[PDB]
Design an enzyme around this catalytic site. Structure first.
Site, PDB file in Angstrom:
ATOM      1  N   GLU A  35      60.233  36.768   9.188  1.00 47.05           N
ATOM      2  CA  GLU A  35      61.171  36.158   8.222  1.00 47.05           C
ATOM      3  C   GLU A  35      62.343  37.114   7.954  1.00 47.05           C
ATOM      4  O   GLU A  35      63.432  36.605   7.813  1.00 47.05           O
ATOM      5  CB  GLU A  35      60.444  35.880   6.907  1.00 47.05           C
ATOM      6  CG  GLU A  35      59.414  34.738   7.014  1.00 47.05           C
ATOM      7  CD  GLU A  35      59.932  33.362   7.332  1.00 47.05           C
ATOM      8  OE1 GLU A  35      61.149  33.199   7.466  1.00 47.05           O
ATOM      9  OE2 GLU A  35      59.110  32.453   7.512  1.00 47.05           O
ATOM     10  N   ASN A  46      70.210  27.334   4.922  1.00 45.67           N
ATOM     11  CA  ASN A  46      69.550  26.205   5.626  1.00 45.67           C
ATOM     12  C   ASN A  46      70.587  25.094   5.850  1.00 45.67           C
ATOM     13  O   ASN A  46      71.584  25.045   5.114  1.00 45.67           O
ATOM     14  CB  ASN A  46      68.331  25.736   4.821  1.00 45.67           C
ATOM     15  CG  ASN A  46      67.328  26.850   4.632  1.00 45.67           C
ATOM     16  OD1 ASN A  46      66.779  27.066   3.538  1.00 45.67           O
ATOM     17  ND2 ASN A  46      67.087  27.570   5.711  1.00 45.67           N
ATOM     18  N   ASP A  48      70.453  22.080   4.974  1.00 48.23           N
ATOM     19  CA  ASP A  48      70.455  21.157   3.813  1.00 48.23           C
ATOM     20  C   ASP A  48      71.249  21.795   2.657  1.00 48.23           C
ATOM     21  O   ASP A  48      71.343  21.139   1.597  1.00 48.23           O
ATOM     22  CB  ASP A  48      69.034  20.748   3.430  1.00 48.23           C
ATOM     23  CG  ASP A  48      68.200  21.807   2.727  1.00 48.23           C
ATOM     24  OD1 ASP A  48      68.632  22.982   2.672  1.00 48.23           O
ATOM     25  OD2 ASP A  48      67.140  21.443   2.206  1.00 48.23           O
ATOM     26  N   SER A  50      70.330  24.534   1.052  1.00 46.36           N
ATOM     27  CA  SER A  50      69.434  25.483   0.351  1.00 46.36           C
ATOM     28  C   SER A  50      69.587  26.857   1.057  1.00 46.36           C
ATOM     29  O   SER A  50      70.128  26.937   2.166  1.00 46.36           O
ATOM     30  CB  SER A  50      68.019  24.983   0.336  1.00 46.36           C
ATOM     31  OG  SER A  50      67.497  24.943   1.641  1.00 46.36           O
ATOM     32  N   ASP A  52      67.365  30.675   1.829  1.00 48.62           N
ATOM     33  CA  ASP A  52      66.119  31.470   1.856  1.00 48.62           C
ATOM     34  C   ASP A  52      66.423  32.916   1.417  1.00 48.62           C
ATOM     35  O   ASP A  52      67.390  33.501   1.880  1.00 48.62           O
ATOM     36  CB  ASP A  52      65.527  31.481   3.257  1.00 48.62           C
ATOM     37  CG  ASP A  52      65.126  30.114   3.776  1.00 48.62           C
ATOM     38  OD1 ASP A  52      64.942  29.190   2.995  1.00 48.62           O
ATOM     39  OD2 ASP A  52      64.775  30.067   4.929  1.00 48.62           O
ATOM     40  N   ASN A  59      62.630  29.606  -0.263  1.00 46.24           N
ATOM     41  CA  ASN A  59      63.724  28.602  -0.257  1.00 46.24           C
ATOM     42  C   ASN A  59      64.080  28.151  -1.702  1.00 46.24           C
ATOM     43  O   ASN A  59      63.188  27.957  -2.546  1.00 46.24           O
ATOM     44  CB  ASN A  59      63.245  27.493   0.679  1.00 46.24           C
ATOM     45  CG  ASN A  59      64.230  26.407   0.989  1.00 46.24           C
ATOM     46  OD1 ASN A  59      65.138  26.160   0.211  1.00 46.24           O
ATOM     47  ND2 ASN A  59      63.993  25.704   2.097  1.00 46.24           N
ATOM     48  N   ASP A 101      49.976  25.646  -2.264  1.00 44.65           N
ATOM     49  CA  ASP A 101      50.630  24.316  -2.415  1.00 44.65           C
ATOM     50  C   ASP A 101      49.896  23.231  -1.607  1.00 44.65           C
ATOM     51  O   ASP A 101      50.223  22.050  -1.844  1.00 44.65           O
ATOM     52  CB  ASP A 101      52.105  24.343  -1.968  1.00 44.65           C
ATOM     53  CG  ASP A 101      52.983  23.189  -2.427  1.00 44.65           C
ATOM     54  OD1 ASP A 101      53.067  22.952  -3.643  1.00 44.65           O
ATOM     55  OD2 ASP A 101      53.626  22.558  -1.562  1.00 44.65           O
TER      56      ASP A 101
END
Ligand code: NA
Length: 129
Positions: A35, A46, A48, A50, A52, A59, A101
């Site tokens: 990462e 990202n 979209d 967003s 990170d 995110n 999650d």
């Protein structure tokens, strides 16, 4: 801050990630390597809109507030900037909520694609833990 491999393994162990939700420490080190290359200041945008943040590239769509991700959530209840700190507490505490999650470490696409099924114990080999 750019951690050393064993330095980060030790910090993640102290913060209770070793076998957290059944994921051995090598899994967390492996995920952080791909990462962020162990850089707390890593950021990536990202498609979209967003972003990170941090060693585990958490995110803004779901987990932190950056003020610039329309319609997003802040489920870790933190500013995304806290994920860039030399102090990994905020990244670790937020990673514990993410991995809880439902999808385990599959939440980290790089863990699924580069760590899952591999000899992840190699990432903590040689370290004083
Ligand atoms: Na957000």
């Amino acid at each position: 801050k750019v951690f050393g491999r064993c330095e980060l393994a030790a910090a993640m162990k102290r913060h209770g990630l070793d076998n957290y939700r059944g994921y051995s420490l090598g899994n967390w080190v492996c995920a952080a390597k791909f990462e962020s290359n162990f850089n707390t200041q890593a950021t990536n945008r990202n498609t979209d809109g967003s972003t990170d943040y941090g060693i585990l590239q958490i995110n803004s769509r779901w987990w932190c507030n950056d003020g610039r991700t329309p319609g997003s959530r802040n489920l870790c209840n933190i500013p995304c900037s806290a994920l860039l700190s030399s102090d990994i507490t905020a990244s670790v505490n937020c990673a514990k909520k993410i991995v809880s999650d439902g999808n385990g470490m599959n939440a980290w696409v790089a863990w699924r694609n580069r760590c899952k099924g591999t000899d992840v114990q190699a990432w903590i080999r040689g370290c004083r833990l």
